[PDB]
Design a protein around this ligand. Sequence first.
Ligand SMILES: *[C@@H]1O[C@H](CO)[C@@H](O[C@@H]2O[C@H](CO)[C@@H](O[C@@H]3O[C@H](CO[C@H]4O[C@H](CO)[C@@H](O)[C@H](O[C@H]5O[C@H](CO)[C@@H](O)[C@H](O)[C@@H]5O[C@H]5O[C@H](CO)[C@@H](O)[C@H](O)[C@@H]5O)[C@@H]4O)[C@@H](O)[C@H](O[C@H]4O[C@H](CO)[C@@H](O)[C@H](O)[C@@H]4O[C@H]4O[C@H](CO)[C@@H](O)[C@H](O)[C@@H]4O)[C@@H]3O)[C@H](O)[C@H]2NC(C)=O)[C@H](O)[C@H]1NC(C)=O
Ligand SMILES: COc1ccccc1C1CCN(C(=O)c2cn(CC(=O)N(C)C)c3cc(Cl)c(C)cc23)CC1
Ligand SMILES: [Ca+2]
Ligand SMILES: [Cl-]
Ligand code: NA
Ligand code: NA
Ligand SMILES: [Zn+2]
Length: 805
Amino acid sequence: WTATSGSCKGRCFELQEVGPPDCRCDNLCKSYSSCCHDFDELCLKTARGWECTKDRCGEVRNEENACHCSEDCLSRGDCCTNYQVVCKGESHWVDDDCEEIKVPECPAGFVRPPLIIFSVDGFRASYMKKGSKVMPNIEKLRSCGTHAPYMRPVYPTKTFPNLYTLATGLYPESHGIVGNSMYDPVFDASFHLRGREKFNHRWWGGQPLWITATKQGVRAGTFFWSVSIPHERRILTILQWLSLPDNERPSVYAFYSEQPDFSGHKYGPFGPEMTNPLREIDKTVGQLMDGLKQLRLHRCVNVIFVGDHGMEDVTCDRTEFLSNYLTNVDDITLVPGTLGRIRAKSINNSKYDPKTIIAALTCKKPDQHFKPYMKQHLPKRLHYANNRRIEDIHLLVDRRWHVARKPLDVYKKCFFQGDHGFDNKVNSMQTVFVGYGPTFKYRTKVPPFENIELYNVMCDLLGLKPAPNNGTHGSLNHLLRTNTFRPTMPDEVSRPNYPGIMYLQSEFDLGCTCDDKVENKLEELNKRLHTKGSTKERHLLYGRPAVLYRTSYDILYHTDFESGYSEIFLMPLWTSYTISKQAEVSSIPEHLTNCVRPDVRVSPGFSQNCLAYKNDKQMSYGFLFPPYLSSSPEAKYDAFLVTNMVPMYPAFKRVWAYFQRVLVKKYASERNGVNVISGPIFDYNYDGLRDTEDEIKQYVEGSSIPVPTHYYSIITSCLDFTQPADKCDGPLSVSSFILPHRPDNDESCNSSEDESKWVEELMKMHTARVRDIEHLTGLDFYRKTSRSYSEILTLKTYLHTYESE
Ligand SMILES: *[C@@H]1O[C@H](CO)[C@@H](O[C@@H]2O[C@H](CO)[C@@H](O[C@@H]3O[C@H](CO[C@H]4O[C@H](CO)[C@@H](O)[C@H](O[C@H]5O[C@H](CO)[C@@H](O)[C@H](O)[C@@H]5O[C@H]5O[C@H](CO)[C@@H](O)[C@H](O)[C@@H]5O)[C@@H]4O)[C@@H](O)[C@H](O[C@H]4O[C@H](CO)[C@@H](O)[C@H](O)[C@@H]4O[C@H]4O[C@H](CO)[C@@H](O)[C@H](O)[C@@H]4O)[C@@H]3O)[C@H](O)[C@H]2NC(C)=O)[C@H](O)[C@H]1NC(C)=O
Ligand SMILES: COc1ccccc1C1CCN(C(=O)c2cn(CC(=O)N(C)C)c3cc(Cl)c(C)cc23)CC1
Ligand SMILES: [Ca+2]
Ligand SMILES: [Cl-]
Ligand code: NA
Ligand code: NA
Ligand SMILES: [Zn+2]
């Protein structure tokens, strides 16, 4: 109930919201059907439109007008944004040369530069170049301030998940808004775009910027605008709030455009009808900037122009139908469109079976345009699993397609020509970022970055301490002139042991054998220096990774590689080795095919055994440093140490062998040497975080050898590839992956072919940030470089995407 009989006189766009059943005059009242009877009349004036004309100049203040051109308007804060241009001989903001803003130039009583967030739905990154002729205001912000060629959205590249990710620094799996439509089984309730349920606070996790601001005494006012309030009125209202007395005036503002997304759905991302919505958004930006110039705030305010996601070409005839794959298509509920999520239609159905559903959806048609996954098998870069609202069965849909349950769902619902929601690495889904103001850099281009990083920077810009989030604070310091946040490296928690030779061969009873019984003082002092770490500056280029949790581990040195060997998990946490461009691939000698050798630095009780692998009919083993890349036949023996062995499914050894035998050398040749760090990952509860031992769900049969859910590799070289990986003076270049450790290759439809036709495509799909690997392992990499820490934070957030330009 609202008793809508109260009045909005003197209250238009009030900043504190009043409680029921008192009527409201704030910018969201419409959306709640709670505005006072006179809100439209008083608060939403339209008379004479939005601009001044020559003959309005100096007029008698008529309060009925939408905005004013009277003489008192400047100090009333309510002029039309073009007032000074039309009536006072001034120029539009876009026509002025840009001049570096070295310091904030603010009026008396401003404690900090205000932040204005200009957010645009569906604004695809390539619009900046392709629409540049019709967006002069946006182009000036772009070229004069700081910009990225694009910003990466989160998955799914839908509106609600991304806008709330922008606001919280959080992955959708942690903030709770995992789709535009959701079912929460604990609530037993559904969330939808259309309707009132999306208003209930229990859906919304984390702590969005407006709450973070409020809690730390920065005034945020009211960010969100009921949909029918026109853009011009939003802009005028922001400008009016900026004229409030210091004690009442917010420090952060937001504007939101439903465009160009609204038109992009209808006409496609590059339909000829798209030029007009771009012009219109530019005009709105021009109004804001002219309005700021009027208030003398145009060299005071920090403006962020930012999008939620792009837009792809998608038509109804590119729809895959699940009825063409499943017989039982009525026992399922599908969330459909540019992603798919499947659950059982009825909880009382124990005839429902996820395994049979996945299998029926797996490589069934030759050009199939979606791929089923159990959510825990999705690429780890998507961070899309650890939420009860994310259904177990997920369909990653190819760009340009839709998935639907039955054809009737599409025509009892071609209308649309655009859509979004696809994998967040897809070019058409990329979006924009521009920062302009005293705190941003002048005329600076920065590399693409993920939208999860922005919350920390918005906090920096406002002097706030960010709530805990998924950004890496400091990774975007290079966008800023000042207010940088100066992070320190985490402290190492566990120190390694450096074991020497402590055990005799006969003390091991591992069931392992090796044909290695063949016999010189020159080369004997050699192998001693090698086991003491004499080649370690070769193979460990950036210092050893720090272990950030409590555990017991040994550093092991070898001619060709160095490892941090975990006495708890009985395998390395990490193995580090450098392959120069000149290096040669040899094969495994025949006599050494099943060779596994005891490591006399490591006790039997902290070693794996070969017997367990023999008994375990599903599981085989691999090595972290590959025998193929040994520097000499004698060094090869080291690669067969039981301390270099890790458990691997035979299906997975196909992937791993191809990567080690073929790809590592190829990367070394192309990148002028590479440093490699590889190791296992255990993430049985799919939370993106290292498992403790009591979380491991699977062991090599009859043993305490834990089975990794994934294997990672981090491959670093010199950004300037004229310098070899081991002698680099400047910035680094990285690519990484987190390969799922699976007992089959069902994920790759062409896996019955030669690895040269499918393995690399699998790896690219499972591309990762070093940061993702750090969360999954509790390790901290790049501890000792000559590079600044902020630059190294940027490198750890890099994702190599394998899209073209
Ligand atoms: C990305 O960044 C985020 C943010 O930093 C990272 O997420 C954090 O990770 C922490 C570790 O997983 C986690 O810390 C735990 O907090 C527990 C209390 O949680 C509540 O309080 C916070 C603070 O206000 C709040 O944010 C939480 O909100 C969650 O839940 C509500 C709904 O219930 C949602 O609205 C909201 O979106 C959010 O959901 C997400 O998180 C939960 C888990 O918290 C997921 O299940 C959801 O799916 C969703 O993803 C909560 O309201 C606290 O109780 C924990 O303590 C346990 O462990 C410690 C060890 O230190 C130990 O002392 C205790 O034994 C305790 O265990 C007991 O509870 C167990 C569970 O029932 C039980 O099994 C045991 O037997 C014990 O009884 C713990 O400290 C933190 O909550 C989240 N924060 C957020 C916002 O998600 C995320 O990790 C980063 N991601 C990556 C990939 O890096
Ligand atoms: C970059 O933007 C930042 C950054 C930080 C803090 C805040 C912001 C913006 C986000 C967008 N802003 C909005 O007004 C929103 C408009 N919609 C669409 C809508 O309501 N419909 C029915 C289509 C939203 C949806 C969500 Cl889920 C959210 C969380 C916000 C909005 C303004 C504030
Ligand atoms: Ca985990
Ligand atoms: Cl969705
Ligand atoms: Na076996
Ligand atoms: Na296959
Ligand atoms: Zn849309």
